[PDB]
Design a protein around this motif. Sequence first.
Motif, PDB file in Angstrom:
ATOM      1  N   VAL A   1       0.842  -1.189   0.000  1.00 25.08           N
ATOM      2  CA  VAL A   1       0.000   0.000   0.000  1.00 25.08           C
ATOM      3  C   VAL A   1       0.883   1.247   0.000  1.00 25.08           C
ATOM      4  N   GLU A   2       1.962   1.222   0.776  1.00 23.50           N
ATOM      5  CA  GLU A   2       2.856   2.370   0.828  1.00 23.50           C
ATOM      6  C   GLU A   2       3.584   2.572  -0.500  1.00 23.50           C
ATOM      7  N   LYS A   3       3.798   1.487  -1.238  1.00 23.47           N
ATOM      8  CA  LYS A   3       4.462   1.585  -2.533  1.00 23.47           C
ATOM      9  C   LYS A   3       3.553   2.350  -3.495  1.00 23.47           C
ATOM     10  N   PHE A   4       2.274   1.992  -3.521  1.00 18.36           N
ATOM     11  CA  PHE A   4       1.342   2.671  -4.410  1.00 18.36           C
ATOM     12  C   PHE A   4       1.007   4.075  -3.919  1.00 18.36           C
ATOM     13  N   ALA A   5       1.102   4.286  -2.610  1.00 21.89           N
ATOM     14  CA  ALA A   5       0.830   5.602  -2.051  1.00 21.89           C
ATOM     15  C   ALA A   5       1.855   6.583  -2.609  1.00 21.89           C
ATOM     16  N   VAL A   6       3.111   6.154  -2.670  1.00 24.67           N
ATOM     17  CA  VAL A   6       4.171   7.004  -3.195  1.00 24.67           C
ATOM     18  C   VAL A   6       3.887   7.394  -4.645  1.00 24.67           C
ATOM     19  N   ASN A   7       3.344   6.453  -5.415  1.00 23.71           N
ATOM     20  CA  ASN A   7       3.005   6.701  -6.816  1.00 23.71           C
ATOM     21  C   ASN A   7       2.003   7.845  -6.922  1.00 23.71           C
TER      22      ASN A   7
END
Lengths: 145, 145
Positions: A93-99
Amino acid sequence: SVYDAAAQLTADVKKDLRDSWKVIGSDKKGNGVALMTTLFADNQETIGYFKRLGDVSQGMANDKLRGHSITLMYALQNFIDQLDNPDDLVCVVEKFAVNHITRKISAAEFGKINGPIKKVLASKNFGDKYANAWAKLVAVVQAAL
Amino acid sequence: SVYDAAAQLTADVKKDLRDSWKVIGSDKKGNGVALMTTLFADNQETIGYFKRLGDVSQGMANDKLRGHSITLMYALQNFIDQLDNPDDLVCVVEKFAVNHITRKISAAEFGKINGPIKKVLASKNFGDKYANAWAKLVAVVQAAL
Ligand code: HEM
Ligand code: HEM
Ligand SMILES: ClCCCc1ccccc1
């Protein structure tokens, strides 16, 4: 707290997410594009963020939009597959949040996806019960923005 | 073109890709991290490109690396699922190509992933035939870079 949000995904919530996903996730191209076209139609003010995709009004005919839409569905598939382990759900989730943080997308604007989700779910005969379950998953991403 | 590279993937090549993915794609977290750590071990010159992930020597313990690795495996899942429709495969490949073009990753550098893929495949007893099949899939992405 993304961790407190993830803690809201109880047994019943996870079951509803899986049951509905079995249906909507079976047609990633079709439902993915439907999700996006609904977002653009119901919230025209978000179209500006998607400048790279060109003319989004073309829908399925737009190759960039189709590629984006299919990929978005795999992000959801990813989330569903990580429900068993909260530590792994959080790191994806944090990976996509950065996106989205790099695109200047706030938690409030990310939440505009709830309307489209409820609508497509409704078209597949999945009511408020399911829409609310998905709102809880979306809330985990919002906590990271 | 990318379409030409995709449209050339034969029935036998698709069969080998799907058969091997059934196995390596079954443990996305484990095999995803293995792929990345192997890339860093054999091609240390690429470590710098991944500064956002922090200390990649931390392996599985590094949440950013873990999140990235799992997501990378879904990009491959996406490719595998689109094998029978070149039009769909091409639009998802171009989407991910942009993600790398923005990072200044050349077609030659992207090809550095073939070594790690061959090693991961070999760890599950999938030989050269399978590594060659995967190199053909990687070549579709290279046609877009
Ligand atoms: C279920 C919710 C959503 C999911 C799972 C999701 C997933 C994704 C994914 C996987 C990407 C590609 C990331 C990349 O390659 O950089 C993306 C891009 C993007 N998303 Fe979302 N997204 C969601 C909701 C939203 C919402 C509601 C907005 C806007 C209000 C938004 C704005 C963007 C923008 C601007 C991009 C960049 C598109 C481009 O230029 O290629 N997303 N999203
Ligand atoms: C099997 C081949 C590969 C696949 C499927 C793949 C997939 C991905 C995906 C899904 C992302 C995240 C995109 C984003 O959210 O912006 C990514 C990021 C990236 N990839 Fe790859 N990749 C591959 C090979 C490579 C290779 C060989 C290199 C380097 C020589 C590379 C360099 C990068 C870099 C620098 C990033 C940005 C990482 C970050 O800061 O988050 N990739 N890749
Ligand atoms: Cl069952 C969960 C469906 C989530 C969704 C995905 C794409 C379009 C609309 C809804």
